[PDB]
Write a protein that binds this ligand. Structure first.
Ligand SMILES: CCCC[C@H]1C(=O)N(c2ccccc2)N(c2ccc(O)cc2)C1=O
Length: 121
């Protein structure tokens, strides 16, 4: 669910998911068009695509369980959907962490009209 993904992001990057990643670029937050602006935006694009591979799951509300094994994120056994949602979130958190060095404030509150393009998953 969104609440856990948010905590996963905070633990991983030290940034509050809601500011930092809820209105960033073309794909972080709500998005469905254009070419990802940078690496972080690409993390969100791939994250959206990951959820897209799970048509019958509900990522926002379905809660999963995960633990930290010395920093490593380990998804615990749950329903099929819960397991797959957790893996999608884990990947996004790591991706955000790997690209913190290029995160830019100029992409925060990015205007919709500047997201022009076609990028298939
Ligand atoms: C702390 C969470 C950061 C997560 C980021 C995300 O993965 N989704 C997201 C992506 C796909 C399905 C559901 C939620 N949304 C998002 C949330 C609310 C909203 O009305 C629109 C988009 C996000 O902000």
């Amino acid at each position: 669910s969104l609440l856990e993904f948010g905590k996963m992001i905070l633990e991983e990057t030290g940034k509050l998911a809601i500011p930092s990643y809820s209105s960033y670029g073309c794909y972080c937050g709500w998005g469905g068009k254009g070419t990802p602006k940078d690496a972080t935006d690409r993390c969100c694009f791939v994250h959206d695509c990951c959820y897209g591979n799970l048509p019958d799951c509900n990522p926002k509300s379905d809660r999963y369980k995960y633990k930290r094994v010395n920093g490593a994120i380990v998804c615990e056994k749950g329903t099929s959907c819960e397991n797959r949602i957790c893996e999608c979130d884990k990947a996004a958190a790591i991706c955000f962490r790997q690209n913190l060095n290029t995160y830019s404030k100029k992409y925060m509150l990015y205007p919709d009209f500047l997201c022009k393009g076609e990028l298939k998953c």
